[PDB]
Amino acid sequence: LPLVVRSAGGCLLRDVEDGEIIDLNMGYGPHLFGYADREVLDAVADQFAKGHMTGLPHELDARAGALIAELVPGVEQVRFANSGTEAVASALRLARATTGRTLVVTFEGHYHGWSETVLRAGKTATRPTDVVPGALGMIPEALAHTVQLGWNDPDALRELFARDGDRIAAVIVEPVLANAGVIPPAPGFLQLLRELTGRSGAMLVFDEVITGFRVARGGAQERYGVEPDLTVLSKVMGGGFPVAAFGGRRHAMRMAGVYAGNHAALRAVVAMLGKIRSLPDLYERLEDTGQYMEDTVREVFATEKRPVHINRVGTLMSVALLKGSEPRDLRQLAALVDFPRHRRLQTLAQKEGVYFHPNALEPWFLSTAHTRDVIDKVAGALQRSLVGL
Amino acid sequence: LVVRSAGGCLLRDVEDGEIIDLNMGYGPHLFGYADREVLDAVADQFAKGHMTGLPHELDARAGALIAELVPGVEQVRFANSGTEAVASALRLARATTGRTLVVTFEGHYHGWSETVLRAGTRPTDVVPGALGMIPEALAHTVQLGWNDPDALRELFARDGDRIAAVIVEPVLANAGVIPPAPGFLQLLRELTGRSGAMLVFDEVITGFRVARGGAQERYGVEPDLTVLSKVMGGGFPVAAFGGRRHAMRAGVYAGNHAALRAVVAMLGKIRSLPDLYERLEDTGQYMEDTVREVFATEKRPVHINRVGTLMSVALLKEPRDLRQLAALVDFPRHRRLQTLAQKEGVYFHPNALEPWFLSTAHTRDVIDKVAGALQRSLVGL
Ligand SMILES: Cc1ncc(COP(=O)(O)O)c(C=O)c1O
Numbered sequence: 005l006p007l008v009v010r011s012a013g014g015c016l017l018r019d020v021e022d023g024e025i026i027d028l029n030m031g032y033g034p035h036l037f038g039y040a041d042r043e044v045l046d047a048v049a050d051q052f053a054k055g056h057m058t059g060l061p062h063e064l065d066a067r068a069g070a071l072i073a074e075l076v077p078g079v080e081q082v083r084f085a086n087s088g089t090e091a092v093a094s095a096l097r098l099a100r101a102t103t104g105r106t107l108v109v110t111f112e113g114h115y116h117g118w119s120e121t122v123l124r125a126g127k128t129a130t131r132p133t134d135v136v137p138g139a140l141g142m143i144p145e146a147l148a149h150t151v152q153l154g155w156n157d158p159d160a161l162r163e164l165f166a167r168d169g170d171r172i173a174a175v176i177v178e179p180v181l182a183n184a185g186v187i188p189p190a191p192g193f194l195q196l197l198r199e200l201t202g203r204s205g206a207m208l209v210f211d212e213v214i215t216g217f218r219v220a221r222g223g224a225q226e227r228y229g230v231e232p233d234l235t236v237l238s239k240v241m242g243g244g245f246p247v248a249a250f251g252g253r254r255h256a257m258r259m260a261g262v263y264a265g266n267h268a269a270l271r272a273v274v275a276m277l278g279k280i281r282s283l284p285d286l287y288e289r290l291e292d293t294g295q296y297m298e299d300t301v302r303e304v305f306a307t308e309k310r311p312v313h314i315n316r317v318g319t320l321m322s323v324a325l326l327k328g329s330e331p332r333d334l335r336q337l338a339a340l341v342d343f344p345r346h347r348r349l350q351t352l353a354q355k356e357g358v359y360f361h362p363n364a365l366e367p368w369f370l371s372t373a374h375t376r377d378v379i380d381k382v383a384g385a386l387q388r389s390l391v392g393l
Numbered sequence: 394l395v396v397r398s399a400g401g402c403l404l405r406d407v408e409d410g411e412i413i414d415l416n417m418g419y420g421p422h423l424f425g426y427a428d429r430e431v432l433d434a435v436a437d438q439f440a441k442g443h444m445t446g447l448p449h450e451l452d453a454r455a456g457a458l459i460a461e462l463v464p465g466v467e468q469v470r471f472a473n474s475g476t477e478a479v480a481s482a483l484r485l486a487r488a489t490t491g492r493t494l495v496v497t498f499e500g501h502y503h504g505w506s507e508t509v510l511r512a513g514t515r516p517t518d519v520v521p522g523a524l525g526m527i528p529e530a531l532a533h534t535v536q537l538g539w540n541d542p543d544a545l546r547e548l549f550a551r552d553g554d555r556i557a558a559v560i561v562e563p564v565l566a567n568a569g570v571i572p573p574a575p576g577f578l579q580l581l582r583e584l585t586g587r588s589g590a591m592l593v594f595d596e597v598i599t600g601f602r603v604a605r606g607g608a609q610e611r612y613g614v615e616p617d618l619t620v621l622s623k624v625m626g627g628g629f630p631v632a633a634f635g636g637r638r639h640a641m642r643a644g645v646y647a648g649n650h651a652a653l654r655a656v657v658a659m660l661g662k663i664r665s666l667p668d669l670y671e672r673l674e675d676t677g678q679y680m681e682d683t684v685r686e687v688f689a690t691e692k693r694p695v696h697i698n699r700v701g702t703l704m705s706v707a708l709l710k711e712p713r714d715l716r717q718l719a720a721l722v723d724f725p726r727h728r729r730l731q732t733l734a735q736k737e738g739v740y741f742h743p744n745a746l747e748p749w750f751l752s753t754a755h756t757r758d759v760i761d762k763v764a765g766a767l768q769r770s771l772v773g774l
C-alpha cells in the first residue's frame with residue numbers, strides 16, 4: 005500500500021495526501037525519542053553552521069569517544085565509521101589481523117551489513133549451516149572463510165569449537181537477534197560464546213548496531229552482563245545521523261571512509277549520548293512503554309482470538325500473526341508465522357492510521373514519543389484492522 | 394592542528410588561530426565551508442523528519458537533478474558512501490555480465506570494499522590495501538598502470554571475454570592529479586564496449602567538480618556506470634551510482650531524507666549557476682599562475698597539475714602515472730614546506746600527492762594571501 009512521506013515528527017508520519025500515521029517502525033531503530041528531536045537536531049544544525057567536515061582532527065572527537073566509553077562498559081577506545089557495514093567490516097578485519105586467522109562465525113538470520121565476507125541470504129534462506137550469498141555479483145570465494153550456525157544451538161557451537169576453535173578469528177553475533185524477529189539469547193548462550201572464544205583465542209564481536217543504547221544504556225553487554233572483545237555501534241548512537249563505530253578495551257584495539265568521523269556526525273553522537281546520559285531513568289521509562297504496548301497488543305489479539313507471537317526486549321519488539329495451526333531461532337519462528345495474513349493486516353492497519361513493516365519478522369522500534377495515549381490509539385486501530393481480517 | 398570551527402576557506406584552531414585551507418576536507422565543498430544555502434536546507438529537513446526509511450517526495454527530486462546534470466545517468470541508486478556505491482556498482486556489473494574479473498589502475502582509489510582495496514614491485518602487482526582481508530579478496534581483481542594503452546590492449550586481447558568491468562578515476566585525483574592521456578578514456582570505452590565489459594567511472598571526486606556533468610562531460614566519454622559522492626551532497630554523507638536504463642536492469646542510511654535534501658539543495662544550487670565551472674576555472678588558473686610565480690621566484694622546481702579547481706602541487710628534487718610523478722618529488726622537503734606554510738596560516742596536506750580542492754571561497758584576495766604565505770614559507774626552507 006503506497007505511502008510517500010511528506011514530513012515526520014514524534015511518532016507521526018504525514019504522507020503526501022496530508023494523512024497522518026502513527027509509525028511503529030520508526031526508521032528501523034535510531035529514534036529513541038521520536039522523529040524531529042530538537043535537542044539533537046539543534047546541535048547538528050549548529051555544527052553545519054560551524055563546519056561539518058574538514059577531514060581534520062576536531063575538539064568533538066575526544067568528547068564523542070569519552071561519552072561512548074562512559075556509557076558502554078566494554079568500550080575504551082573507538083574508531084568511527086560512516087555505517088554499520090563499514091564498522092563490521094573493520095572490526096572483522098581487525099580480528100583476522102589480530103589473531104592471524106581467517107574464519108568468521110555467524111548465526112543464521114543475524115545481519116551484519118552488506119560487506120563481501122558477511123552478506124548471507126537470511127530470511128531468503130536448505131539448512132542453518134549452509135552459507136548462501138546474500139547478493140548476486142559477489143565473488144565466488146566471498147564467503148569461503150565464513151561459517152554459519154543456528155542461533156541458540158549450544159551443541160553445534162561446542163562441536164564447531166572442538167573441531168575448529170584454533171582456526172576461528174571471530175564470532176560475530178547480534179546479542180539479541182533483532183533482524184529476523186526479536187529472539188533473545190537462550191539462558192547461558194552469550195556466556196558460552198564468551199567462554200569458547202576466550203578459550204580458543206577467537207575474538208567475540210557483539211554487533212550492537214540495534215541493541216546499543218536501546219535494550220539498556222550500555223546495550224546488551226550491560227543487560228546480559230557479558231562483555232565482548234569488540235562492539236559495533238550505530239543507529240541510536242547518532243540519532244539517525246549516518247554514523248557508526250566499533251571499539252573495545254585497549255588490549256583488543258592494539259592494531260577509512262572519508263565521511264567517517266565527520267564533525268556533524270560526532271556532534272550528533274555528543275548530543276544524543278549527552279541527552280541519554282542526562283536521563284538516568286530513561287530505560288525504566290522505555291521499559292514501561294514497551295510493556296504497555298506488549299500488553300495492549302496481546303489483549304487485542306487475544307480478544308479477537310487471533311494467535312500471535314510477540315517477543316520484546318525493552319522497546320525492541322516483534323509482532324507476528326500465527327497460522328491457525330518458544331522458537332529459539334529464525335527457522336522455528338518463521339515456520340509458525342502466517343506471512344500473507346500478516347501482510348494483509350499491515351495493509352489494513354495502515355488504512356487505519358498505523359504503520360508497521362508488512363514482513364512479520366521486521367521488528368517494531370518504540371520511542372518515548374509512543375505515549376500511553378498513542379498506544380491506546382494503536383490498540384483501537386489494530387482492533388479495527390483485525391476485525392477486517 | 395585541531396579544528397574548532399570552519400567557514401568559507403578558513404579554519405579556526407583550538408588556539409583561535411585562523412588558517413586558509415587548501416585541502417577543504419578532500420573534495421565536497423565547492424562553495425566553501427558552512428554554505429548556508431545547503432545548511433539551511435539540511436537543518437530544515439531535521440525539523441521535518443530526517444529518516445523514516447520510507448519513500449519520500451525528495452527521492453524523485455534528487456534523482457531527477459542527477460539525471461539532468463549528468464548525461465550518462467538516467468536511473469540512480471543511493472548509498473551512504475562512495476565505498477558502498479562502488480561495491481554495488483561492481484556487484485551489478487559482475488551479475489549483469491556473468492563475469493568476475495574487475496580491472497583497476499595503480500594509484501586509483503575506490504574505497505575500502507574487499508574486492509578493490511589495493512595498497513596505494515610493478516603496476517601489475519595486486520597487493521591488499523588492508524590487513525585482515527580474506528586471502529581471495531583480490532583474486533578477481535587485476536591492475537594496470539594508469540595511462541598505459543599497450544598494457545591495456547594486451548589485457549583485453551588476452552582476457553576481454555572474462556572482464557566484468559573496468560573501474561577508473563577518469564582523472565586520477567588520489568595520487569597526484571593525473572588526467573587521462575589524450576585518447577585513453579576513448580580507448581577504454583572502445584575496449585570495454587567490444588568485449589561486453591562494463592565501464593565504470595568513479596566520479597566521487599570528479600563529479601560536479603571538473604564540469605557540471607563531471608569528467609564524462611568534460612572529456613566527452615560516457616561510461617556504463619557512474620559513481621558520485623562528495624560535491625553531490627555538499628559534505629553530507631551520501632553517494633550514488635547510476636547509468637542508462639539498459640545498464641541498470643542498501644545500507645540502512647542509504648537514501649535518508651536529510652542526505653537527499655542536501656543533494657537537492659546542492660545540485661539545485663549548481664544547476665542555477667550556468668557559468669560556475671567557468672568561474673571555478675578562473676580561480677584555478679589564478680591559483681596555478683600565482684603558485685608558479687612564487688616558486689619560480691625562489692628558484693624552487695615544482696610540479697603542478699590542474700583540472701579546474703582540482704590541483705596537485707609538489708616540490709621537486711610530464712609524468713603520466715604515479716610512479717613517474719613520485720620519482721620526481723622531494724617528499725621530505727615538501728613535508729617541511731607544509732609545516733612552514735601551516736605556521737604562516739596556510740594548510741595543505743603534507744603529502745605532496747594529496748591534491749588541493751579549491752572553492753568559490755578561494756577568491757583572488759585569498760589567493761594573494763596564500764602567495765605571501767607560500768613565499769614566506771619557501772624562504773624559510
Ligand atoms: C575516487 C574516490 N572513489 C571512492 C572513494 C570512497 O568514498 P567513501 O570514502 O565515501 O567510502 C573516495 C574517497 O575519497 C575517492 O576519493
Ligand SMILES: Cc1ncc(COP(=O)(O)O)c(C=O)c1O
Pocket residue numbers: 032086087088089090092115116117118178183211212213214238248643644645646
Ligand atoms: C545488527 C545490524 N548490523 C549491521 C547493520 C548494517 O548497518 P548499515 O546499514 O548502517 O550498513 C544493520 C542494519 O540495519 C543491523 O541491523
